[PDB]
Design a binder for this molecule. Structure first.
Ligand SMILES: Nc1ncnc2c1ncn2[C@@H]1O[C@H](COP(=O)(O)OC(=O)[C@@H](N)Cc2ccc(O)cc2)[C@@H](O)[C@H]1O
Ligand SMILES: Nc1ncnc2c1ncn2[C@@H]1O[C@H](COP(=O)(O)OC(=O)[C@@H](N)Cc2ccc(O)cc2)[C@@H](O)[C@H]1O
Lengths: 356, 353
């Protein structure tokens, strides 16, 4: 037989999946998992705690498309109970659920392939099998000491510095339980969530569980301003939101940090690299004749090169980044304009006060 | 009208007299005027054989409370025992112990309509959303340090490695109080911190219906300095299934300092178990040692012991005899009810963790 084309295919698949990742734990387990002649279950989880920003909408969608076009199933875990537990929207569950419904409406208009995508609500799923779920949570809690768990504080945007409520011990125990409860093959969350993903791998070793989840962390999309490592709602003025208008996006991009001929810590370059290039498979720099005219970058290396050496002005990088982000947002805008029910949902959502 | 206030008053006096400490007496009165059928509960980790505090001592309090129209829930804390690593965390063993607990309780004075045997696992799982929602809401109300103040309710301390289970457990025990609609928490004083936690949670949440804590005193262990009979304090306990000779053996070896009442385990048993059960204490002994004497008050018993009128050996012989008398229905039930007998035999095999 010449099924050496299968090994070649897996390696092609592995390299493609990894190209979208910031850190894989571990790459070898991932290859192993891919040879499982079966769909791999991936998931990411979201606190419904305010407006969605483009990391959770546009960037997520690039990654999910890559996965589902390579034999994976993808679960969006609408972590409503988690948001409540973390005091979001003052812990008001009715508001959290409305935000959760809003998130789904966005994701459904993000040009994601839905054949292999699932939206699951934490509260619904847990309450379908509360004995199993809670037994798991308890078993996890008896396996790690308080200090160990306290080092997962980051997964909920918390620190040792603030007053540490017992809920901050339950939450990580519950997030860890999710991984097994949902039978995840691949935890595909942002790098800020990694500590609880590592905790789950540790749990496997402790319980001598052979089926171990692979941690496929993506990098943080940076905020608009210098020094903002993480676009988010809790970093004032860092985020472009999924409901931002065309002029909104233009205005935030124009005001963004984009240092001349430097790529490190440059959020504008980061959007070109992590969002636009993977979406278009090319970056087409449109620029005046005054400035060298249009040029298509077929590779990230060529792009980095022309930027770092001043061939690409910052203004030109900005203008194009803005344009593409607007084009990418257009389907979402169209949905929230043409679907009056979605429009109303967005409307109610914006009225909320973002509690921490 | 008057007789009503007399009724409630006497009752209130009955309830209060048992207790080592009641928080708060006034609230208890309000509770009785509001409802004659109060819900009281105590909770037990099925973590090994049941010692006499949880049976003979328990019965005295329970019967005094139920005879007044109260319902008393026995909370078989199976998931709690498992969470707290008892019986090697084997749910099957824990359940078997739970079943044996019920057989002991029904045979030592608590086979009655007003007593309920409830399993934590079962009850939680009838309304899991409500139970767990409560546990979560409690967790977001208290910080870790505050919660670690409840460590004694599970026999743990700050000193040892503190697993996250030791945070969840108190959240769950606190949730139980509301989940079972408890009017009176009737637990040992060693459980008081989580009971205070619940009262603190009410204030935080502006809950006006607030539980009364009616804590009973700890029964000392057999040996010197052991202030609490328990499975954890080594060779400190008399078990409800102990045979006559086991009882004699253990009482004989027990700590019983002459003249001294404080920290005297043997006197404690006489005082807290025997005397309330018989409403007297009949001291059998040789003429030369002082002869038989019937005590009608604890004051006379205490006076005589303090002054050395009763030698430790005479107190021990009599306490052993009485304890054996009190265990007789339990002994018979386990020698006769073959199902209960098999349960015991099996239960005795298990290693305590
Ligand atoms: N700026 C930026 N760049 C790339 N990825 C980002 C990002 N901000 C947030 N993310 C990722 O979005 C997912 C959800 O974010 P979150 O609402 O802050 O999630 C955390 O609160 C989780 N603890 C929610 C959760 C609960 C339970 C469970 O089983 C899984 C997740 C994250 O992947 C984040 O990295
Ligand atoms: N030596 C002694 N004297 C008097 N009372 C005693 C005693 N040792 C134990 N007790 C009381 O018996 C009950 C059961 O004791 P436990 O199994 O050690 O109870 C604790 O583990 C509880 N956390 C179990 C529990 C879980 C959940 C819930 O809602 C209620 C109870 C106790 O009253 C103890 O004081």
């Amino acid at each position: 037989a010449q099924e050496e084309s299968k090994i070649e295919d897996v390696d092609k698949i592995l390299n493609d999946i990894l190209s979208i990742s910031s850190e894989c734990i571990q790459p070898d387990e991932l290859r192993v998992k891919l040879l499982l002649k079966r769909k791999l279950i991936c998931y990411d989880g979201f606190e419904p705690s305010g407006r969605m920003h483009i990391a959770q909408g546009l960037l997520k969608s690039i990654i999910v498309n890559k996965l589902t076009s390579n034999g994976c199933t993808f679960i969006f875990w609408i972590a409503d109970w988690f948001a409540h537990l973390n005091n979001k929207m003052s812990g008001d569950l009715k508001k959290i659920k409305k935000v959760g419904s809003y998130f789904i409406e966005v994701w459904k208009s993000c040009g994601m392939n839905m054949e292999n995508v699932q939206f699951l609500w934490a509260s619904e799923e847990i309450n379908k099998k509360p004995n199993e779920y809670w037994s798991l949570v308890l078993d996890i809690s008896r396996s790690f000491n308080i200090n160990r768990m306290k080092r997962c504080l980051k997964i909920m945007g918390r620190s040792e510095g603030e007053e540490n409520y017992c809920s901050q011990i339950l939450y990580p125990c519950m997030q860890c339980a999710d991984i097994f409860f949902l039978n995840v093959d691949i935890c595909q969350l942002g790098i800020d969530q990694r500590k609880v993903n590592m905790l789950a791998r540790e749990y496997c070793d402790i319980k001598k569980i052979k089926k171990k989840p692979v941690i496929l962390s993506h990098g943080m999309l940076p905020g608009l301003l210098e020094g903002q490592e993480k676009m988010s709602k809790s970093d004032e003025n860092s985020a472009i939101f999924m409901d931002d208008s065309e002029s909104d996006v233009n205005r935030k991009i124009k005001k963004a940090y984009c240092p001349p001929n430097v790529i490190e810590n440059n959020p504008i370059y980061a959007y070109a690299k992590s969002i636009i290039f993977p979406s278009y498979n090319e970056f087409n720099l449109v620029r005046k004749e005054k400035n060298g005219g249009d040029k298509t970058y077929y590779t990230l290396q060529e792009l980095e090169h022309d930027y770092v050496n001043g061939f690409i002005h910052p203004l030109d990088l900005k203008d194009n980044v803005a344009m593409y982000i607007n084009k990418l947002l257009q389907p979402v805008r169209d949905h929230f304009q043409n679907n009056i029910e979605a429009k109303n949902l967005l409307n109610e959502i914006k009225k909320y006060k973002v509690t921490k």
